[PDB]
Amino acid sequence: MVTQLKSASEYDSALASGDKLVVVDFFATWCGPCKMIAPMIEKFAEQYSDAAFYKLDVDEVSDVAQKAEVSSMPTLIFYKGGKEVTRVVGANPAAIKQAIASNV
Numbered sequence: 414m415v416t417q418l419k420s421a422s423e424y425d426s427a428l429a430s431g432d433k434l435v436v437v438d439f440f441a442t443w444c445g446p447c448k449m450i451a452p453m454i455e456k457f458a459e460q461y462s463d464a465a466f467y468k469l470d471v472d473e474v475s476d477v478a479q480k481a482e483v484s485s486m487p488t489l490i491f492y493k494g495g496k497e498v499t500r501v502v503g504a505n506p507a508a509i510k511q512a513i514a515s516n517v
Contacts, residue, residue, distance in 0.1 A: 414458060414461075414464065414465070414466065415455060415458040415466040415468070416465055416466055416467055416468070417468055418467050418468060418469055418474065418477065419474075420476075421476040421477065423467075424467060424476070424477055427465065427467070427492070428492055428495045429495055430495075431465070431492060431495060432493070432494070433463050433465060434461075434463060434464050434465060434491060434492075434493065434513060434516045434517050435465045435467065435491070435492040435493075436464060436465055436466050436467060436489060436490070436491055436513060437467040437469060437477075437481075437488075437489060437490045437492075438454065438466065438467065438468050438469060438487060438488070438489055439469050439470070439471075439477075439478060439481070439483045439485075439487055439488040439489075440470065440486070440487035440488070441470050441471045442470070443486065445486070445504075446486070446487065446504040447486060447487045450487070450504070450506055453506040453509065454466065454489075454506070454509050457506070457509050457510065457513070460510075461513055461514070461517060462517075463517060464513050464517065484502070485502035485503070486504075487502070487504070488502045489501045489502060489508075489509075489512075490502070491512060491513070491516050493516050499512065499515065499516055
């Protein structure tokens with residue numbers, strides 16, 4: 414399943430009592446994987462049974478991107494215990510399966 418984070422509440426409450434797998438995606442659609450991998454991760458979303466896909470850009474939100482400083486392209490992270498433990502900031506689809514399928 415794919416989610417759309419419009420309000421910080423959807424993100425905050427997700428890191429609090431969020432035991433399941435909480436995935437985040439920070440990409441301002443510059444040019445490259447950020448747009449080429451969109452279908453990949455978005456497509457894999459229909460593969461998992463309990464994977465929270467949090468989509469975030471920059472201006473569209475301005476809340477998360479503000480606090481959660483981005484240092485990649487794109488920038489994906491995995492939250493299991495309300496704390497970034499298994500992050501994945503690079504560029505590779507397969508990295509989502511072995512990642513999501515792990516924390517799942």
